[PDB]
Assembly symmetry: C3
Homo-oligomer: 420 residues x 3
Amino acid sequence: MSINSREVLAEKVKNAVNNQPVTDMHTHLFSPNFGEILLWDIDELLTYHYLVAEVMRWTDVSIEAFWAMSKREQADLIWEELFIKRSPVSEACRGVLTCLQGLGLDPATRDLQVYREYFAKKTSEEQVDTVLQLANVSDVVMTNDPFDDNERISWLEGKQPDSRFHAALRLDPLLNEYEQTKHRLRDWGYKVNDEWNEGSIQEVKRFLTDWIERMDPVYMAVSLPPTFSFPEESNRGRIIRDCLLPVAEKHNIPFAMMIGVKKRVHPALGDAGDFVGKASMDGVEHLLREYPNNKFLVTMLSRENQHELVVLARKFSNLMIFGCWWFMNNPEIINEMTRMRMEMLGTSFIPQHSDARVLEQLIYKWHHSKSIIAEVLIDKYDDILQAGWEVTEEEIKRDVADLFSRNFWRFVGRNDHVTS
Amino acid sequence: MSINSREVLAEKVKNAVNNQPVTDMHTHLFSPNFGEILLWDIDELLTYHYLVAEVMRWTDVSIEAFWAMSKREQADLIWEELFIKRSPVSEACRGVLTCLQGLGLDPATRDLQVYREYFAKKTSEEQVDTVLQLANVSDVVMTNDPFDDNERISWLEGKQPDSRFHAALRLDPLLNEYEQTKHRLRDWGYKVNDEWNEGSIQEVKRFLTDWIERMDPVYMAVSLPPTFSFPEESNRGRIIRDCLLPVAEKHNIPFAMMIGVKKRVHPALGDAGDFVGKASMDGVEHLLREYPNNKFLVTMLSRENQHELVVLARKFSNLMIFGCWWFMNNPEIINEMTRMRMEMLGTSFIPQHSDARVLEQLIYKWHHSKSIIAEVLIDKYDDILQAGWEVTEEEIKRDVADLFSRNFWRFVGRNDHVTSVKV
Amino acid sequence: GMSINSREVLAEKVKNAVNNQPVTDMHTHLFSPNFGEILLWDIDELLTYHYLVAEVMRWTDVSIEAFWAMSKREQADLIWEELFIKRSPVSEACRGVLTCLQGLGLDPATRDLQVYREYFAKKTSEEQVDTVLQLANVSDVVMTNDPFDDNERISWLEGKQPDSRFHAALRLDPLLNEYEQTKHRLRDWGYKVNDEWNEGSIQEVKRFLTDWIERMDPVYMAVSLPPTFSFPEESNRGRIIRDCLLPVAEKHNIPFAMMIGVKKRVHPALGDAGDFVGKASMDGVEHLLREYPNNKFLVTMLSRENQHELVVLARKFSNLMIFGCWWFMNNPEIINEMTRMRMEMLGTSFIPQHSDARVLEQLIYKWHHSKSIIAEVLIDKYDDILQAGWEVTEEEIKRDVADLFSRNFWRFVGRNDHVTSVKV
Ligand SMILES: [Cl-]
Ligand code: NA
């Protein structure tokens, strides 16, 4: 019994998409046994830096006074200003409501005290079980930063993430701030020299290889500015060339590059203070061509890089593009991006990741994105259906599996939580 | 109470949008007592520069011969070329038809001579009353250029605008043509020197302050090229730093920057001769960061600048972004811009202004833009209702008021014409 | 006769007008069937279009070297298996292959690639051209004619003329972008260009242009240009354009077609599938339009990020005709946004699409896919003016549709289509 109309296709696709367990291959979450660095609950949702930026456009409260408030005072203020005093129509505010609803709380009542009561009853481990189930996420990739004292501790103590959580080695401080990070590496025993000589090359490689051994990361990642260039006679250029790319190749680990972030244009806003610019594609093109035995995962921040990044993926099979990152993570842009991407790459890409910083965001990030992606799929399958092609439900489930999970694991050359 | 259908939602949003009096916070209209610089009528609509550009793509008539023609002849040619010989499907041509319809004229007859008869029967003051009612526009912000001899006369004679019309001081000749303009300032008794010294600084400030006192402007405005940078050692860079910003901070008057116009790439087209380019955001970013006690209003001309402008608005609360300017003022682009803005800023922006150069254009500019903005709001409300939120009709009316009027007045730190009459 | 009473009735009228209108496809890589094997056709050529080579290389374990070592049939088999069977053929290029097979009466439901092949084995080139132009509703095809390609050159030198449905367009990439290498061939052909760019060099390059203009009767002369294109420029390209091409173009009243934004061979092993894109400066195009008002220019651009500003540049200059959704733009999401921006700012005074077809049958999908998108843009735009009180008539719809799909081009180039050249 064939799928022979758009109407039935819409049912089968929406269901296949809803039922597919997601691998979220870039997040800011942590296994619950790491302790308090895992953020969760309605106050954390309301104080997400996305909503700090937004509240500051309305409130008379100074940013100084805001940071001096408690977490609950901050959440109260953002609730009042973004939900009660104006309708919560932005993507970030909507996402808070999608989360409350998904947990079985009722946004109709606007009863924040009662929302808070739900979270006070649970342990972190319970809420992870709840959220992963509700979000239908089988596997989460963490962002693991050896230079963050608060996170390093857990690794140093012999803690392992539970099997649903995977490590990814974040290298920004090493690559973008080597002149400072130099001295931390020396204090940790990595005997880097003032000169970029064989000794410094071998000791930075050892630092990388030691952390790879300890975390077993799925990839190594870096955020890069719009002015990113390669090759480059800079600390960043030399490290990529001489240390990171050879180690990534040896271990068959992809190098993830998140390009286009301009750091701290409004420092007082903290995490809400970063900006965006369009990047040259030249450095990415060079890396792909001149390092055919390295694998690259790339996502870019500027709307204006998105089409050319898709074309670049047509050129190089060692590029996997992923996600609608940050300022790209808004319905209007997710839609145009996913359509361009599918049109020129078919199913050979990773449409989305959450970048979740608070546990419950998995619910809204995946619900909001799946609905858009489902609709793109329905359009694209219908177009071939009307061309005379038979699409089977098995084939849909396969394609959707590729998009939400298998493409990633196939590219990184490892197995998920269920397969292992 | 709460809404729970998309039927009922669409209705309530569309009615709220239609019923909300608009503040049009950037136009090229004037109070009717200013005389003939207020353009109106069907011949003015048809010879708007947007349509001169379009007709020049089709007609065998040279641009020279076109400017040699009378207004009625130009209008006649444009009607034949763009409406009769091809269907009037462009946004500008569509707009002409929306105006005629809104006035109660029937575009079905295509009877241009009959449309003309309507306008011959009325005064400027009558037509302004008619159009502001039909467009539901309560407040119009003008573009007032003290370097235009025609306009400067009225201000200097002591004419004050009708309470529905507000001043905005346009400074392009000062900031962008100082090499010529410095000599006019001198001729007006402002003792600017050849060097940029303390004397020149204080005299340019005095010019600004005299015009602020004369016009009571709601903001000071400049149009800027794609190559705009700040800081910069240039005439413009020094006037902004030394004169404009301190004067604007002292009086608490925003600085409006309309960025991305490349002037006169086709000189023979006149007003239709200007082009566009993408700007760097660096100068705007620097201004917002380093001048936190100044308020900035910004609109940009390049499609490729729109998303990063929204992000910049997320960084800086002294930034208010506004409108879909000029080449952006097209349904396809109004739609994508309004959606991005709302997704990232909620209701903390000004979605639209008209740039109306001819009075009747307020009808189409607002009717076309309101319909798109209403669609966007319905979608965003529907998304939060789907998430369990209950929207009330009063909350809708409030959101709509913010977007079409109150956001502007709150930002510029003044009252509109009705609140002024009350306060 | 009757008013258009509803959007539903509008839609059927527009879709009918669009479907019935014979297309002039003003830029293709097809040839008149009498040119011989250089006209590519059949399912194996469809499947090995370089768009699909790019896509199969993202999936398959087969090396690019091993791929090129395979026969055409083997290549087609791999591509079918990897992009149609192992994953759903949802990409625009893949979908296009299915639209083609369907259009020819070959049923994609069966996936019977061997039976599809049998269809093509039964026919001549000339029979397939008749079939495909009828099914695609294409009246007139404009070729890309390169005098430097020996494989094509031969047909011209043999005194062969294109079938009257096929029109010549003179491609000048090797002369303009590779002059220092091409000089030597010019000299072999008796064009005695000098080491210096002096009068003799100017006159001999002009003579080469004039010779080919007279041989091919081209409707325009064409070049593809990188994102770093500038004019004026003290380069071989800049000098040839200024001193030879613009003067000859003006004398003969032939437009100059520029396809801007291709970055050649960023992945050389992929061959034709190895080219990339960048955003260009508009300055060179602006300068040419302004400073050469007696020349006509046809422009299409490769970067998404140039599209809006190109439409604005058309508003400025009546000697600019913009055309098409080129290559990486030739994707429904992008065709839609482009056609909407264009019509919003230019009305009907542009050429919405061309196919760039490299394999004969692509005319079918390229025009079927594009016509559906353009029909829907037209429906939206007519509906908006009907809602403003304007009475659009069916005859006016057909007129506007004739303008967009054929007449705008023939009017701009100052020449007649095949049917009009028979009558005259
Ligand atoms: Cl751009
Ligand atoms: Na769009």
